[PDB]
Symmetry: C3
Subunit: 36 residues, 3 copies
């Protein structure tokens, strides 16, 4: 159980980090729009 | 104790997945604005 | 590991909450950007 949960948590952090990257790319596109 | 942790983890995956759906919708709107 | 697991989960939750807040703000700004 300890290692099966450890693996689920590690996968969540990895996915939480890929979400963060997609958000930065979105913020940059928006930045570009707001500066004509 | 273990089953409560398992429930918290399943809830975290559900939220993380909803966020991913929303991000998909945002990308579509931003591309419509880019080149209308 | 019990309490260390719960500490990792608490961190995932606050991190996902911060992402939730940014999504709200981005969704508002996109509609405002579409308005004008
Ligand atoms: Tb998460
Ligand atoms: Tb179980
Ligand atoms: Tb505790
Ligand atoms: Zn372990
Ligand atoms: Zn291990
Ligand atoms: Zn506990």
């Amino acid at each position: 159980e300890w290692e099966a949960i450890e693996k689920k948590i590690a996968a969540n952090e990895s996915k939480d980090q890929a979400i963060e990257k997609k958000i930065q790319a979105i913020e940059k596109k928006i930045e570009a729009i707001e500066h004509g």
